[PDB]
Design a binder for this molecule. Structure first.
Ligand SMILES: Cc1ncc(COP(=O)(O)O)c(CNC2C=C(C(=O)O)CCC2)c1O
Ligand SMILES: Cc1ncc(COP(=O)(O)O)c(CN[C@H]2C=C(C(=O)O)CCC2)c1O
Ligand SMILES: Cc1ncc(COP(=O)(O)O)c(CNc2cccc(C(=O)O)c2)c1O
Lengths: 402, 402, 402
């Protein structure tokens, strides 16, 4: 019942794999969240880009409610009338031959690694089990053994047994390093985030994505774009990669694909790649279930109908321009695209990002630091200019109160 | 004859592999340098740590002058009376069984890689040509094909053909990454600089070197310490690694080993490692020549007799403490050990490190930026407190004139 | 103090990467060397062609002595008044646009490989990292990982980890093999020694160098001539390649470039090749230092003023003609050009080249076998006919005493 009671209970019956910001939410609608004491807050995290369409979006909620009375899961042992409709929809929306439905973001990543590997052997001709996938330092795509194996962050891999072989890491936003890495004919793919979220919203230099595409094509290497956090209007486009008109070989979607109402994930690619996996060689119990498909279609429609991409683009500019007005002795950097932004706090003797977020919380705005001194600002794409302007002032006062 | 004439001539008859600070020196003594116009300057670069003992140190100069009239080079085909004297001296000074004499820093590095590899196969038992050497990102140990192959800096490797296999790179100042890397039994060694010079004087966290030593020992991996720039009193100790009482398996020395009077390099290690290389398997025409050995002995004696290490330690503190008094909107960071220091210039619309160095030059102090916004401050170890204090003020005025 | 004490000391404190001829020299002047017991010897090795001008040549010694009191090293971070003077001198002497100054022979070689590669990509248009450099079997250009990678001699490469990719080897003195090799458009250069020194003074057939030049030009491949041992009057010309009037694309000089007083190396080529390397892409701490430049200028002047080339040519003929008078059951072959010569000892049950060299030593002449049965005879170019005649008799008696 009480925030402290809630914290207390979780601490007793739940694993301590997290250290959340001490706020106990019980309701959320649009850009707002309310804790157990009734206090309202601006959501400047969007569940890590999962609630782009805002919390409990009516249209998506309706889709869930209508389908639950009909069918929720049959398993892929049999067909369900909804999946194919969703598949046709998403493949045409993103312009790819097929889609492989999964549940979580890591799963989409695993699927991509399996597609890349399978393709490397069956199509590229790499000798069995000598295939490698290159990743960029600072990457974050999940918590599976394989995912943490490509991580350069000790917090993800330290203490977690022997790691997955075949994973090469190179610096991010580095075309020369990529080119150097692609000299090995055993490389099957390169997986990259158009903008690294958890690394601290690190935006690569303009031309980077074009370079990656040119390099991968030239060396017969698959370009896997992890758009699980940057895609679906978040950065101001359907896919962050759209900013440079780049067409990755494989695109990974997740989070906002369901508006935060169901774990839905997707991996898009053409037949020459997708069909390397035969019947019975890959799957998931919940992947492609009826319920998740209806919410996915609805979540995608919301993004389309409400032109959330153009909104994100317009308002992001304002957000960044205003944030840049803050004192350099305070905010050392402001970066992002669309509504995926972050500020770098100059950690000193007294203050730090956590403290800023605690006080920010006290002033009605919810956010969390990514790397101790980096604070992410990513409010639902349904936010309005005035609402943005109000939150911006909450950020200003908090920042200027230390 | 004229500075501009000098620049002009070099531009016409010399390769453009450099873009030096526009100053044409013709004389140097101790901490001072004089250009062709007679203008005196404080040397805050020390020829990249090669003139620790100061320019044209009388004692070293005498050693060179006496030996040149006797013998300079016989080649290693025959013995010369000087080499063995030097060997006994340096091995006992640094407490290692033997020393392999070479000329340049890269050569010492190459020798270490060859020792590591040879040892990996003959002693560790690694299968022929599967041995790997791990390096830390940001490393810089020369310009040979092999050296640039371990580099993460595009300026060193871009455009320079296929690279040397067997070189693994991990982040610097990262014990978890090292440990993860040492899981491969094929790793023969880990080469690290106690403090990365060219990376921008990046000092690892206290305990790092102890961790590296513990990790290497535990995994039967050679710990190669590149002390070519941090050693010989530069950081305040005979070897920077002395700060944590760590004993690397192989130590690389160069630069100041001759006071800047002759290219002399050295690789120190015990018999179990050194003796893996048999007669006729490694060498150099000039390595271990009589002339270089006399200057080397003299250069080492100067460091000892004049207690330059303790001086570097004492004055470095002052240098850093004073530099830290500068405005944060100007100097964003000050780092170093002994007289190996650097400041990070907040590059803005108007100013940058090059400009600061140009004006610094105009005010009588010579220094050069390492990475566009990083300026190194490393004056000869023979500098005095008042002289340091004077140069410090030259730095202050220049910094505060923008 | 004693020869055996000297051998003993080195064996204890120095790496065993060599097995020199048991002679402990302490002084050398001109063509003579004196050991610790005062015994005088004729130097028939010239420090592997490093002391062409004779040991401790007064003119070169003076140059070193004058410059040491002024400036020795500033580093390439700043300009020094001497370098440009030397550059203008050497470029005009050899008739090439520019010169890239380095320290050791291998470094000049590495620089050439980097120039060839860089040129291959930026000017020839070879795809990134597919460029190859062809070498001739029996080649020897140093001890770096890259250098040993082109070696066909097990003693240089065996046990030294994975090798450098992109290095193709073809038989020496073989135009058809070269032509066949140059069919691959990815070949950027061909590095050759006009006469292979360490292979055992193997002189190619007349017309070979002309063929190489015609072939390289026709296939847009750089002709890199390693004149580090054959150049600077040693064979009877400024460059051994002068014998056929061939102009290589890149010329490598070293050893005698300083008369054995300082490690000085040089790589000469025109702008279209030299300028492919931009500022900050290649260098060396000691490369182009003031001290080395003065000795280099002096060493070159000595060669010029004293007409050492014509002397080497004249006396070499006498040396070879006399050596050929030896019994075939003893000396199976006599070869060379200028003062770069060698005899092939018919190794039998009792005698061998080492033994001949040991007894030769006992008779006052110092030489060393290159490949067990090949003995090199290369005395300083300052030798006189009578002195040569005397040494020739020492060779005769020794050879005829078995
Ligand atoms: C870019 C990216 N790709 C994949 C994933 C993994 O998605 P999930 O498996 O559905 O979580 C992510 C993860 N995004 C975050 C998850 C967090 C969490 O574990 O609590 C925190 C922060 C980001 C991303 O980012
Ligand atoms: C730490 C370290 N180790 C080796 C070397 C290479 O030694 P050299 O072959 O003697 O140069 C260096 C190089 N230091 C610098 C060299 C240059 C240059 O090539 O001009 C510039 C800056 C530093 C080390 O730093
Ligand atoms: C033809 C040639 N090119 C380059 C080199 C290497 O120069 P270095 O200055 O030694 O780096 C050489 C090496 N010449 C040599 C012959 C015998 C023995 C040695 C040695 O002891 O390593 C060197 C040649 O020949």
């Amino acid at each position: 019942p009480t925030s402290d009671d809630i914290f207390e209970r979780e601490y007793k019956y739940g694993a301590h794999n997290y250290h959340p910001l001490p706020v106990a939410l019980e309701r959320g609608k649009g850009i707002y969240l309310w804790d157990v004491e009734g206090r309202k807050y601006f959501d400047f995290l969007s569940s890590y880009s999962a609630v782009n369409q805002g919390h409990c979006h009516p249209k998506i909620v309706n889709a869930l409610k209508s389908q639950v009375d009909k069918l929720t899961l049959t398993s892929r042992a049999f067909y369900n009338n909804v999946l194919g409709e969703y598949e046709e929809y998403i493949t045409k929306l993103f312009n790819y031959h097929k889609v492989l439905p999964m549940n979580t973001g890591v799963e989409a990543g695993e699927t991509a690694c399996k597609l890349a590997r399978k393709w490397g052997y069956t199509v590229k001709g790499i000798q069995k089990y000598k295939a490698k996938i290159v990743f960029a330092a600072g990457n974050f795509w999940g918590r599976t053994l394989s995912a943490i194996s490509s991580s350069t962050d000790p917090t993800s891999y330290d203490g977690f047994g022997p790691f997955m072989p075949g994973f090469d890491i190179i610096p991010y936003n580095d075309l020369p390093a990529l080119e150097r890495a692609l000299q090995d004919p055993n490389v099957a793919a390169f997986m990259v985030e158009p903008i690294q979220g958890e690394a601290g919203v690190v935006v690569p230099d303009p031309g980077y994505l074009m370079g990656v595409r040119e390099l991968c094509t030239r060396h017969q290497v698959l370009f896997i774009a992890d758009e699980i956090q940057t895609g679906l209007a978040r950065t101001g486009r359907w896919l962050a990669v759209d900013y440079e008109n780049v067409r990755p070989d494989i695109v990974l979607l997740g989070k906002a694909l369901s508006g935060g109402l169901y774990p839905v994930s997707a991996v898009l690619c053409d037949d020459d790649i997708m069909l390397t996996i035969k019947p019975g060689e890959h799957g998931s119990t919940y992947g492609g279930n009826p319920l998740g498909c209806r919410v996915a279609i609805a979540a995608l429609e919301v993004l389309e109908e409400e032109n959330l991409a153009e909104n994100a683009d317009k308002l992001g500019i304002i957000l960044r321009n205003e944030l840049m007005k803050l004192p350099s002795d305070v905010v050392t950097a402001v970066r992002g695209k669309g509504l995926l932004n972050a500020i770098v706090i100059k950690e000193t003797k007294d203050w730090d990002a956590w403290k800023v977020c605690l006080r920010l919380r006290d002033n009605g705005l919810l956010a969390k630091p990514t790397h101790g001194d980096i604070i992410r600002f990513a409010p639902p794409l349904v936010i309005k200019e005035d609402e943005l302007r109000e939150s911006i002032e909450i950020i200003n006062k908090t920042i200027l109160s230390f």
